[PDB]
Amino acid sequence: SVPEAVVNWLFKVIQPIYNDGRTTFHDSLALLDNFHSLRPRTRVFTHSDGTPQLLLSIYGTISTGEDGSSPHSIPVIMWVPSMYPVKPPFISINLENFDMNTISSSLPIQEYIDSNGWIALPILHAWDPAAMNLIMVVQELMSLLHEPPQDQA
């Protein structure tokens, strides 16, 4: 389980920041419970126009579906916007820790990444606030570390 001290800190830090604190709290905790390789922190986000904003961020690694001598995970940083779930999370690669020399360019990461390190996902282009959550975003991210199955005829 998520440690008690972290649960209570999460509730406290969310209240003053989030338009929908109940949803942000629940969904953040569900993400942490389902992905033990992720953990929370608060950080000042710098918006494009310069505006700073204190936000909850969830960071760690997600699975490549490989192990042994193969790369096992990719480091990521998610930011939960203050209007969540009306606005979806921002997702980035942790660039400083990205294993450029081992992770295969065969992973379609380059398809989805911008020059600033942000990841676009199809779920973000079909975002449905009432019916989606943070877990779904991470599950999709995991699926997009792989090229689709092809027509084999």
What CA–CA distance (Å, rounded) separates 91 from 122?
A: 12
Is residue 75 a contact point for Cl ion (CB under 5 A)? no
Closest contact distance (angstroms) between CB of 103 and Cl ion is 4
Q: Which two tokens stand for residue 53?
A: 């904003």
Closest contact distance (angstroms) between CB of 59 and Zn ion is 19
Q: In sequence order, what are the residues at sequence separation of 6 or more whose Cβ sits closer than 8 angstroms to the Cβ of residue 139?
A: none
Closest contact distance (angstroms) between CB of 68 and Zn ion is 5
Total residues at interface with Zn ion (CB under 5 A): 13
Question: How is residue 137 annotated by DSSP?
Answer: H
Do 69 and 39 form a contact (C-beta atoms < 8 A)?
no
**Stretch of 41-49, 58-66, 87-95, 133-141 lying at the interface with Zn ion (CB under 5 A):** 58-66
Residues that bind Zn ion in the complex, under the rule CB under 5 A:
20, 23, 30, 33, 66-68, 104, 108, 111, 146, 151, 153
